[PDB]
A paper describes a structure:
NLRs are a conserved component of plants' innate immune systems and survey the host environment for perturbations caused by invading pathogens. Intriguingly, the NLR pair Pik-1/Pik-2, which recognises AVR-Pik, also binds the effector via an HMA domain but this domain is integrated between the CC and NB-ARC regions of Pik-1. The integrated HMA domains of RGA5 and Pik-1 appear to have evolved from a family of rice proteins that only contain the HMA domain. Each of the Pikp-HMA monomers adopts the HMA-domain fold (Pfam: PF00403), comprising a four-stranded antiparallel β-sheet and two α-helices packed in an α/β sandwich.
The closest structural homologue of Pikp-HMA (defined by PDBeFold [Krissinel and Henrick, 2004]) is the HMA domain of yeast protein Ccc2A, overlaying with an r.m.s.d. of 1.58 Å over 72 residues. Typically, HMA domains bind heavy metals, or lighter cations such as Cu1+ or Zn2+, via two conserved Cys residues and are involved in metal transport or detoxification pathways. Interestingly, these Cys residues are not conserved in Pik-1 HMA domains, including Pikp-1. Hence, the Pikp-HMA structure does not contain a metal ion, and the loop between β1 and α1, which usually contains the metal-chelating Cys residues, is disordered. The absence of obvious enzymatic activity in the effectors, and a lack of large conformation changes in Pikp-HMA in the AVR-PikD-bound and unbound states, supports the hypothesis that effector binding promotes domain re-arrangements in NLR complexes.
Numbering used by the authors:
A (entry chain B): 184 to 199, 201 to 258
B (entry chain A): 186 to 199, 201 to 258
Write the structure that this text describes.
């Protein structure tokens, strides 16, 4: 508690309703404070939270939505 | 078709947080969701073309008691 505070930007392949799936999965993750679609193409998700493990999050995304990659973490 | 800010209060009792966040985030027109308030019991929703009436009833059906607190 509260755990490490991070802002994480993920690129996800979500062209398909696919955006809605990505956003829901990320929003459902423990420690999440905010989730936002960003970039001109709305092809990225910015997540702010406390004690989020980006490793698990990324793996859950690749398993359930599509290819996903960490672009920023701070 | 301007940028909307909608704040909803959700009874956080059923994780109930996670469900609400997931439902709101998956709703049409939604660009961002954020948990806000000292008690983290409100969701701030930003987007374009969000229908607040449908959002609220979807929450009440699926997650629990929810009311609009702010629309701008």
């Amino acid at each position: 508690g509260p755990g490490l505070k991070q802002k994480i930007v993920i690129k996800v392949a979500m062209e398909g309703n696919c955006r809605s799936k990505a956003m829901a999965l990320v929003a459902s993750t423990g420690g999440v404070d905010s989730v936002a679609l960003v970039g001109d193409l709305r092809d990225k998700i910015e997540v702010v939270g406390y004690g989020i493990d980006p490793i698990k999050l990324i793996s859950a995304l690749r398993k359930k939505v599509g290819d996903a990659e960490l672009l920023q973490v701070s």
